[PDB]
Design a protein around this ligand. Structure first.
Ligand code: COA
Ligand code: DSZ
Length: 180
């Protein structure tokens, strides 16, 4: 499979999902910084990304988790730029289940980048039998994420009541799945 390269997974001519590396720390940090205000609306962690060193620490931990298959953290490269992150936040090996996460900088939204990335990951891990069940869980009012999940052929399984905390408040999540 020539799409599985040493540096990452080639989705198409424009998108590669890069294995994390320290060299990406600067670009990743700047991207988060540019999007911090909007990102804080939908994710907890951006509120605390204050220096490049925080992105270095994230990369270091992501590489450890990737090595041990605890997670699969990938940096989305669109053309020449890092666009965001797509991940299996959690890989449950016993139950062959992967929980998906993602984000894109504002300048990279509306381009199908995450949809294309997810479809590729599901082909690679799902059609090979490594993962049986893929899950997207996100706060109910996250309109763009809901659209992405449905666009990728996921099915709504239910609402997880008061399951995600942002800034001390618990919010309901939709849980979507795609089963091979
Ligand atoms: C969730 C998020 C990644 C969605 O980004 P996105 O760009 O809408 O994601 P997709 O890859 O599904 O792209 C779909 C959009 O690209 C457009 N489109 C353009 N080219 C396309 C292509 N090649 N394939 C599919 N759609 C394409 C679609 O029409 C759609 O645009 P629309 O929203 O104007 O209808 C983004 O809103 C984000 O990063 N949000 C903050 C982080 C977050 O909330 N993460 C999830 C935590 S719960
Ligand atoms: N410090 C950091 N720097 C850069 N990216 C980071 C990061 N911390 C996390 N991410 C990435 O942010 C994305 C979204 O992860 S998330 O934990 O904020 N939320 C969810 O997954 C929802 N679906 C809710 C749920 O799954 O319950 C993932 O791709 C992570 O790898």
């Amino acid at each position: 499979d020539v799409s599985l390269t040493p540096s990452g997974i080639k989705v198409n001519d424009e998108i590669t999902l890069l294995y994390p590396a320290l060299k990406y720390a600067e670009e990743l940090y700047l991207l988060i910084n540019q999007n911090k205000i909007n990102f804080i609306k939908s994710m907890a962690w951006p509120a605390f990304v204050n220096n490049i060193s925080d992105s270095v620490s994230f990369i270091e931990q992501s590489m450890i988790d990737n090595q041990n298959e605890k997670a699969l953290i990938l940096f989305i490269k669109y053309k020449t730029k890092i666009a965001g992150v797509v991940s299996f936040n959690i890989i449950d090996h016993a139950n062959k289940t992967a929980y998906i996460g993602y984000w894109l900088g504002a300048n990279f939204q509306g381009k199908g980048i995450v949809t294309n990335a997810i479809n590729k990951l599901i082909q690679e891990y799902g059609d090979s039998g490594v993962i049986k069940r893929f899950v997207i869980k996100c706060i109910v009012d996250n309109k763009k994420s809901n659209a992405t999940a449905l666009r990728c052929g996921f099915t709504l399984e239910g609402v997880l009541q008061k399951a995600e905390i942002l800034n001390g408040v618990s919010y309901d999540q939709n849980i979507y799945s795609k089963v091979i």
